[PDB]
Amino acid sequence: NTRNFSLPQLQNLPIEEARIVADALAVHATSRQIDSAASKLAALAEAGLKGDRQAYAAYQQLLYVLSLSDDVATAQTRRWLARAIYRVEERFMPAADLSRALSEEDFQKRLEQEIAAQSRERHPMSQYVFSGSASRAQLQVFLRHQWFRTFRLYRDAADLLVNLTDVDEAAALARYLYGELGEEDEKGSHPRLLAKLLEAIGLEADFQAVSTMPEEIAYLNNRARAFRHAEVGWGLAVFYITELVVPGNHEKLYRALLQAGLSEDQAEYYKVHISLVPPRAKREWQLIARRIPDVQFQNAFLTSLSQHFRVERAYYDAIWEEMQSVK
Amino acid sequence: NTRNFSLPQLQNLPIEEARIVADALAVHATSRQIDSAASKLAALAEAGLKGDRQAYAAYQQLLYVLSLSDDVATAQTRRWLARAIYRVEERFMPAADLSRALSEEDFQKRLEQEIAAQSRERHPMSQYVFSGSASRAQLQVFLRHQWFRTFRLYRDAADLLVNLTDVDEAAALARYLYGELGEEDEKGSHPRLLAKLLEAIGLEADFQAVSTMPEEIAYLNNRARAFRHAEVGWGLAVFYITELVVPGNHEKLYRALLQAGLSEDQAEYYKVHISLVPPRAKREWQLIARRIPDVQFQNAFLTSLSQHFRVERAYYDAIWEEMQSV
Ligand SMILES: O=C(O)C[C@@H](SC/C=N/O)C(=O)O
Ligand SMILES: O=C(O)C[C@@H](SC/C=N\O)C(=O)O
Ligand SMILES: [Fe+2]
Ligand SMILES: [Fe+2]
């Protein structure tokens, strides 16, 4: 009942700094113990981002524990420590580095060119699933990782809701959350729809799941960082590229799963997005349109979009390799 | 630098700790500056809660700035500093020390008993307003403070949503937020419904409103602390006490405003809770029912409830005093 709490995970990490983090998470942890943990985490991230593969794996695994564990008692300090890593990560990410604001037209055009160039729908694995050709074992690989992307997405969206101080924009994210959590029926929440689909093909849907795929950990860490960022451009970038790409991708995945012999009801997870999302996306765009004139927003948004695509592509690459290792 | 950002509010507080907090909220503030702010805030709260009236008012004003300002860039550090104060505050609150969990029936009975003993609806001001004897200006006093209670309640609910790790419990709070923010029409969010009522009776509904009433600040500080607490018994206590009391209170406030010459549409803010809340309260009860076997939950819940009633009563008393002066 605690496999995804912070302390059990930290005691299982053959990383020295895991003990310093654990001490920082104690109920009566001192300011010096917490700041010490912050210092070791920041140094570990700096070493990893400079090319040290062992330091890279260490800082990522610790950041996964800090940002996505489920013991709320340590969450505030965990997020405080996560911030020390985020500051390094962001100070290492290629910045959009506009000196002045792009036109709204050039902003949408640049947005459109990047989405066209790097969307998950064009990935060879995606066309492969669409192709029909995937074995059952290979669809299990795909859906096993779909679970990690879907099952706590609503929490990342809630972090963005919390940071939208304007009541009408919070209302927009609330409408998103309501839809995502099943409207009036929590049995129809989108994680539980995906769980039903997973159950139909022989897989478990574990609400305490802890990933051991490095590229997947990298993807979830980045998404939580972006949705929690104080400059909501980071979260709006990730939110909007998802809400924009989901319908076409889910339409083709839906068709592929019925072609794999599952029913309309089992694949409901994909079906509902095809119809639920497009109109709400049109309303959600105003939160972005409102901010276009601000170059600080443009730089946060475009930097976040580019980083999200880099980690998504490496994640999809690793899933594709795993898929092809089975038959 | 808007009126409800942290730095403009801090510059207006003639307190030395206000400058230390200001330095701690700077973009390149060091860990030493933040720990200094945290220490001096904790010491200020300790001095105020032991009986230093000026330190009491001072830490309460500072906590209002930390917990409820709207400059998101400092939000994470402000909440870190608020926690240093919360830790002190919770050591002074009378804590429920039950060693064994009440039965579900005994627990519900205790809640009902505490509500019948402490509900805001029994306050002399409430009865007086219900009587139809309130002046237009007196109703204005009432609604000015209604604004402060209503306009950001959804954010506190959202903090509880974030701390409910169970997908089904997050969903229950999401349904609450959806209802609270107007469902498909943000023009009908409940803050905007209250704004429509305030404007119908000559008042401005300011989404950057900053309270200057000490008891109102104490109320809002406590409610945000409770909804943000890592042990969700605190927030579930305040959430559930509010959801339980709102329907009957709002029906009578609605009738009283209609008696005073307000339209059905103008007073919609109070009307919509009469029918929206009773259905939602029955589904929200399962969040409490599932945790009743846990005595730590019961103690957190009951301590929250008693503290909430304490700050709410002092707040209604202060509104009542203002209403009598007009
Ligand atoms: O990749 C992501 O982060 C988004 C997920 S889920 C979209 C909505 N799910 O309820 C996906 O794989 O489509
Ligand atoms: O006491 C409070 O803080 C609650 C508000 S109403 C909230 C309505 N629906 O959630 C009031 O002042 O009546
Ligand atoms: Fe969804
Ligand atoms: Fe409401």
* CATH code of residue A226: 1.20.910.10
Ligand 1, from A119, A129, A153: best to mutate by most atoms within 8 Å of Cβ?
A153
Pick from B314, B307, B312, B238: nearest CA to B86: B307
Give the total number of structural domains in chain A.
2
Residue A54 lies in a domain: yes
Pick from A89, A84, A83, A97: nearest CA to A303: A97
Coil, strand or helix: which one is A72? Answer: helix
Residue A62 lies in a domain: yes
Does A126 share its domain with A264? Answer: yes
**Amino acid identity at B256:** A
Question: Do residues B269 and B191 lie in contact, with contact meaning Cβ atoms separated by under 8 Å?
Answer: no
Residue A1 lies in a domain: no
Compute CA B32 distance to the chain's CA centroid, rounded to the nearest angstrom: 32
Are B177 and A178 within 8 A, CB to CB?
yes
Distance CA B285, CA B291 (A): 10
Hey, whose CA ends up nearest to atom 7 of ligand 2? B150
Coil, strand or helix: which one is A183? Answer: coil
Q: What is the resolution of this structure in A?
A: 2.2
Are A72 and B177 within 8 A, CB to CB?
no
Pick from B232, B289, B277, B297: nearest CA to B96: B297
Task: Label each residue of B68-117 as H, E or C.
Answer: HCCCHHHHHHHHHHHHHHHHHHHHHCCCCCCCCCCCHHHHHHHHHHHHHH
Task: Label each residue of chain B as H, E or C.
Answer: CCCCCHHHHHHCCCCHHHHHHHHHCCCCCCHHHHHHHHHHHHHHHHHHHCCCHHHHHHHHHHHHHHHHCCCHHHHHHHHHHHHHHHHHHHHHCCCCCCCCCCCHHHHHHHHHHHHHHHCHHHCHHHHHHHCCCCCHHHHHHHHHHHHHHHCCHHHHHHHHHHHCCCHHHHHHHHHHHHHHCCCCCHHHCHHHHHHHHHHHCCCCCCCCCCCCCHHHHHHHHHHHHHHHCCCCHHHHHHHHHHHHHHHHHHHHHHHHHHHCCCCCCCCHHHHHHHHHHHHHHHHHHHHHHCCCCCHHHHHHHHHHHHHHHHHHHHHHHHHHHHHHCC
The residue behind tokens 């020295």 is: A16
Distance CA A62, CA A43 (A): 13
Question: Do residues B282 and B240 lie in contact, with contact meaning Cβ atoms separated by under 8 Å?
Answer: no
Does B184 share its domain with B271? Answer: yes
Ligand 1, from A129, A143, A246, A269: best to mutate by most atoms within 8 Å of Cβ?
A246
Does B204 share its domain with B127? Answer: yes
Distance CA B160, CA B148 (A): 19
Measure the CA angle with vertex A4, ends A7 and A73; round to 5°.
55
Distance CA B190, CA B146 (A): 12
Domain end residue (candidates: A41, A67, A90): A90
Residue B97 lies in a domain: no
Residue A74 is encoded by which pair of tokens? 């340590």
Neighbours of B172 (CB within 10 A): 19
Does A86 share its domain with A111? Answer: no
Does A140 share its domain with A255? Answer: yes
**Amino acid identity at B22:** A
Minimum CA–CA partner of A180 in chain B: B171
Can you give the CATH number for the domain in which B55 is found? 1.10.1240.20
Residue A261 gets which letter from DSSP?
T
Does A63 share its domain with A190? Answer: no
Residue B98 lies in a domain: no
Does A79 share its domain with A131? Answer: no
Residue A158 lies in a domain: yes
Does B74 share its domain with B122? Answer: no
Looking at the complex, report in whole angstroms how far the Cα of residue A266 sits from the nearest Cα belonging to chain B: 20
Residue B225 lies in a domain: yes
Phi, psi (deg, nearest 5) at residue A231? -90, 95
The DSSP code sequence of A12-25 is T---THHHHHHHHT
Distance CA A231, CA A241 (A): 17
Does B177 share its domain with B319? Answer: yes
Hey, whose CA ends up nearest to atom 8 of ligand 2? B246
What is Dmax (Cα atoms) for chain A? 58
Residue A12 is encoded by which pair of tokens? 């299982």
Does B292 share its domain with B313? Answer: yes
Residue A119 gets which letter from DSSP?
-
**What is the residue range of B59's domain?**
6-92
CA of B193 to the centre of ligand 4 (A): 9
Does B265 share its domain with B208? Answer: yes
Compute CA B258 distance to the chain's CA centroid, rounded to the nearest angstrom: 27
Residue B178 is encoded by which pair of tokens? 């959806």
Question: Do residues B72 and B7 lie in contact, with contact meaning Cβ atoms separated by under 8 Å?
Answer: no
Compute CA B96 distance to the chain's CA centroid, rounded to the nearest angstrom: 21
Looking at the complex, report in whole angstroms how far the Cα of residue B182 sits from the nearest Cα belonging to chain A: 7
Sign of the Cα pseudo-torsion (A196, A198, A199, A205, in order): negative
List Cα–Cα distances, B126 to B121, B200, B202, B264, B267, in angstroms: 6, 21, 21, 20, 17
Q: After which residues is chain A broken (C to N over 2.5 A)?
A: none
Compute CA B57 distance to the chain's CA centroid, rounded to the nearest angstrom: 18
**Amino acid identity at A44:** L
Does B273 share its domain with B318? Answer: yes
Q: Which of A158, A170, A178 sits opposite B175 (nearest CB)?
A: A178
Distance CA B310, CA B315 (A): 9
Phi, psi (deg, nearest 5) at residue A2? -125, 15
Domain end residue (candidates: A37, A61, A90): A90
Coil, strand or helix: which one is A35? Answer: helix
Total number of residues shown for chain B:
326
Whole-number CA gyration radius for chain A: 20
Residue A314 is encoded by which pair of tokens? 């490496």
Compute CA B33 distance to the chain's CA centroid, rounded to the nearest angstrom: 30
Neighbours of B229 (CB within 10 A): 23
Terminal Cα-to-Cα distance of chain B (whole angstroms)? 34
Domain end residue (candidates: B92, B127, B142): B92
- Using an 8 Å CB-CB cutoff, list chain A residues near B232: 72
Residue B114 lies in a domain: yes
Neighbours of A163 (CB within 10 A): 21
